[PDB]
Amino acid sequence: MKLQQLRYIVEVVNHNLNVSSTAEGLYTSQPGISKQVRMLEDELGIQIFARSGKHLTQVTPAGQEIIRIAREVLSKVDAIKSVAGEHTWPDKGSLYVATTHTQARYALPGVIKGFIERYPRVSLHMHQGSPTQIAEAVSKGNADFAIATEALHLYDDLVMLPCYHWNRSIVVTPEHPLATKGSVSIEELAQYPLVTYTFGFTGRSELDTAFNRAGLTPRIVFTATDADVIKTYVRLGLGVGVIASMAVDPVSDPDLVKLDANGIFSHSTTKIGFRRSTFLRSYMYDFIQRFAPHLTRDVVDTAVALRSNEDIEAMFKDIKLPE
Amino acid sequence: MKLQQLRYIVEVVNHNLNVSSTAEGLYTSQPGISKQVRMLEDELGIQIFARSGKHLTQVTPAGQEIIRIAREVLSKVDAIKSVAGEHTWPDKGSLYVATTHTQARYALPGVIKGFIERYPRVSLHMHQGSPTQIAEAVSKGNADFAIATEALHLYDDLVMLPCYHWNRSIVVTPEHPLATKGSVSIEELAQYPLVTYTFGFTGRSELDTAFNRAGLTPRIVFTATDADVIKTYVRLGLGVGVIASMAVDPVSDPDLVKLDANGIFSHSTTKIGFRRSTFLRSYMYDFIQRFAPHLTRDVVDTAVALRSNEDIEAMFKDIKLPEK
Amino acid sequence: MKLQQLRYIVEVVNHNLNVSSTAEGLYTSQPGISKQVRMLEDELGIQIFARSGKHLTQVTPAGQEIIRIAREVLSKVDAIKSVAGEHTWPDKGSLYVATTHTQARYALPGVIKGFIERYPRVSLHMHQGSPTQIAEAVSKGNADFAIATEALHLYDDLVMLPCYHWNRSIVVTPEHPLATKGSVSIEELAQYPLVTYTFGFTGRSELDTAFNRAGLTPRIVFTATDADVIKTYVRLGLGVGVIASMAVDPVSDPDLVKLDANGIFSHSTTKIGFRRSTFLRSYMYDFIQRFAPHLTRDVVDTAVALRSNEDIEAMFKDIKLPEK
Amino acid sequence: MKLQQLRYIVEVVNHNLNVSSTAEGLYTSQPGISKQVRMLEDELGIQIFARSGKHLTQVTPAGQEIIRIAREVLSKVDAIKSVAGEHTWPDKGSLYVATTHTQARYALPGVIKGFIERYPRVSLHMHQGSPTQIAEAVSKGNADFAIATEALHLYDDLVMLPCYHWNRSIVVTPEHPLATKGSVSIEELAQYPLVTYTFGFTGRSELDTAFNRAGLTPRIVFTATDADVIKTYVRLGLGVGVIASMAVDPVSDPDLVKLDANGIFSHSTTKIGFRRSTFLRSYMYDFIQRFAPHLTRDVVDTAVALRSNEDIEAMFKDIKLPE
Ligand SMILES: CC(=O)N[C@@H](CO)C(=O)O
Ligand SMILES: CC(=O)N[C@@H](CO)C(=O)O
Ligand SMILES: CC(=O)N[C@@H](CO)C(=O)O
Ligand SMILES: CC(=O)N[C@@H](CO)C(=O)O
């Protein structure tokens, strides 16, 4: 059978079985129509229309099922012509970044907003994880980039690109013995129960270093992997939170008290990282310099071309990285 | 657009993008098909296939949508001719079923005999195969029904009707250690070389689940599609078969012991099923009911109007189906 | 054989066969560990690891068995110390839970507050992650409990206790086409770019099933592990989010509309679970009951004595769990 | 803690809390035992044994749980020493053959019985399928060999190794108008309803050829992919079966009647096939010559070395292949 026959029998019913009126609507002749209809009935060996004279009188019981399915065939062919084009698919590439939650929510949404404007057909996949985990996916071949924010010793066999420096705040409820006070100390911090990151104390971290040096041992009551849970947890009593300062601002967090701890702990450096055997696509270079605006193609190319991350550190020695 | 163009592109996929093979298949020539393909591409404004040189390498994203719809169009066309058949002469036509060797050999022979006796002018065609091939046969228009025994996620796009639940046996030669000793644990079973289906272990079968639960890995020496090959292999040494309990006959299977493996592996469910676009002729409703007594005509049509195989399951929630 | 040797080989696997990384991790030196490893190999008469030059390339079949057992041995050792803790001072210790961002942010804060109030000398450690990482944390001894929201086949080796059923929402900016129009079909949804979890589409999730049923393929522009990232992304243009309905607040989520996607995707089930080898301290039973009221102590111990998570399910068959 | 401590406390309970008797059984001294026990209790900070004098009096409530788990630790360590060796695993290789059911049940069980004796650590995987399917897996990379028994036009881009020739029988029930008769004909075959293979009639097959040439059209009532179902189906009435002669023998099939059809249809040739880009392992060469004993390594090497299957056909031109 042909699509055309199907069109003709549906149309003959739209026009109330008037074949002459069918012809005018379809820009053809009554013999044209009638030839196709009769050919279809011959092919199928069943009458789709009852006739009395030359005249169509009605659709036969069987014809009614054929016309119903025929209407479905037509509708589907339209649907074929409606199938959207190759530019609706994001198959121009895929970028897999392993990073932190604060980085993805307070840092990168400003970058993501850009990368997607430029590359609307590259798909973007932000995996989160402990410093340990972040570093493992890059090695394993599961991730393109690694945005290490600390414990950068784990990101060992990877290019290391300094992006900025960050500082740990102390967070407390408004009513807390620290909420009204000006500056606070290491000794009188360790006095309180501590709420911080799950990987915060490992035996080599900075939080640790500041307690081992002071011969103090802190009382940890709650840890989480994500800062937003540390903060939600501090909607309670006596605990003291120890997270990134960028994880708290008084606009979103008016129910909390952000409080300098800049002179209490050493500072950290969020680097970006990736395997050396990875062809840097355009969208890759793009993400890097969207995150850190000084990591322009040339800087990166100049950076990777070297032999050791010591040499990149050497390279940025006397340049004030952002804060 | 033309039906022939939709046939051609569907057949190209059916033939694994091998256009020389397609052309032999439809008794025309490669240039005939390519011209038709390219015109469709031109007409739609969409490449259906990625290309290399003279080779087709893959169906594109957009091509995939177009092709899916093309498959529906052609199945509708075959429904038109089936409706005419039904009205012209109800007791005359053909039924194609795709299933496994065990279903054919042990669940169907009776059912078939009955049917052929009632419908001597209906030709019946039984394809045997793996879950993947059963799904394939229904997809390429080679089969009206699937009778599927496991891996039911391969049939989410079909209407599938529950038939019965079944369980597996461990089966060995009478010498074998497990014969003499009582019941068998997964830890015990894991220490021997396993004989089972090619789709026995897939990463997500009932056999996988039992082994993942115990944190064990199976030692697989021999697989086959057909439970009957597997059964001949066990005529030797240490190998332990893992197959359906109904593939073994306490009478006509005299050289094999049949150990209770109901407590190692969970049961599977056998379903019979079709594309929603298949016109259900009277002999087809009969075939379903003869295979599965509780699938009366109203039960079927009731089941077809629902949205999901999960909704169909719900229909049968306050019933207990046969165990086999 | 020595405990230290079993620690070492387990840690080598935990560290992805990276022995330099292992050695840094346990504050000793690579030669220390290699010597211990090789001696174990020598003692057992089995290479645990395949090697290349100075590199470990994979764990061998036999090595895999040995390692699985080694993991049990070490968990038993930690059970000994947990029992001593329980008897010496019940209200003092640590609880480690691994779960998703939404569980932490929206199902736990209350539950936690209650617990910390009753047990001020129990430190609580909440790891957030993907189904794969939740399973990983319990396997490497980093977590006492998993609260798993989907992909439950990743936990066949744990005792898992049903908590509640949950469903997903389609979520968009108020401009978006779908806002204005009524209910949404999968065919409609498939025509937009999707925003969902990194484990949203796996080949066997609830999202896959809905799409396979309709014969459609999703256009995935953005994934993230955390429902909250996904929610910030939808502050833009066309992208349509597919996430849990409880990750969205008709109050504190004011820039997003929440479309009924209960009729596109089937529900999932949130379970809480542990290795059978974990000694259940009193505060742990409390944590379970506080999270899931119907998991009383007897219900738990009743559930642990059963053989399967499927048997556990059966316990709850004549009950209807909470929907969230 | 150490395994040794665990051993000591379990053993002290096996010996009914007599430490001196424990020492003799373990070839050590009472101070030896007692040092480890006390060290464990110190590590755990809980008493495993109640004491009255120097004497053990009983296992404490907590000690009873520790000794129970300790017994489980010991048992597991034994289980480690019981883990079977690398020679219990079939990881020396895997062979994926795509063939027919008759071939796998009446032909290859004699070969399989051999291959497994020689290679007990190569796993063997027999996939079955329509001639079409058999040929597709080889191409796709899912199979190592293809044992085509007919429609060898599908096995196009593959090495083709003739193994033997086979002939189609006719099968019927004892009571059938053909059961007592001697020889039968093409015309009076087409008189009956036909039970044969699902791919039997394609438009190029031999069954076809013999009917197109004779200007006859047969009445097909039942097809199956497997011969055993064709035969089981012929436990009925009037149908006539058309399958391989090797698929029927009067020992297994006494309820049937096998009946020459050698002069009614052309003969077929079961070849073995494989991609040219496939390194023939030892177990591969082995299977080929176990199936066809004349396809010895040298024959195969001599066979593949050529350029066209026409040349292999040329090569076997005047050699009587088996039957
Ligand atoms: C800047 C940042 O994201 N810091 C981490 C801490 O490593 C965080 O998740 O807060
Ligand atoms: C009951 C049944 O047919 N089972 C399949 C395997 O799922 C078989 O072929 O034996
Ligand atoms: C209800 C829930 O927690 N769902 C997961 C996804 O399965 C989430 O993180 O949102
Ligand atoms: C020899 C053989 O196996 N022949 C096929 C027919 O192609 C069969 O399955 O009987």
Numbering used by the authors:
A (entry chain B), D (entry chain B): 1 to 323
B (entry chain A), C (entry chain A): 1 to 324
The authors write:
Under conditions of sulphur limitation and in the presence of the inducer, N-acetylserine, CysB binds to cys promoters and activates the transcription of the downstream coding sequences. CysB is a homotetramer of 36 kDa subunits, each comprising a smaller N-terminal DNA binding domain and a C-terminal effector binding domain. CysB is a member of the LysR-type transcriptional regulator (LTTR) family, named after its founding member. To elucidate the subunit arrangement in the tetramer, we determined the crystal structure of intact CysB in complex with N-acetylserine.
The H32 and H3 crystal structures have 2 and 8 molecules in the asymmetric unit respectively. In the H32 crystal form, a crystallographic twofold axis of symmetry generates the CysB tetramer while the asymmetric unit of the H3 crystal form contains two CysB tetramers. There are two protomer types in each tetramer distinguished by the juxtaposition of the DNA binding and the effector binding domains. CysB(1–324) was crystallised in the presence of 10 mM of the inducer N-acetylserine. The ligand is enclosed in the prominent cleft between EBDI and EBDII. It is generally well defined in the electron density maps of all of the subunits across the two crystal forms though the occupancy is lower in the B molecule of the H32 crystal form. The carbonyl oxygen of the N-acetyl group of the ligand accepts hydrogen bonds from the hydroxyl of Thr100 and the amide –NH2 of Gln103. The side chain of the serine forms a charge-dipole interaction with the Glu150 carboxylate and a dipole–dipole interaction with the hydroxyl of Thr149. Meanwhile, the carboxylate of the ligand forms interactions with the phenolic hydroxyl of Tyr197, the aliphatic hydroxyls of Thr100 and Thr102 and an ordered water molecule.
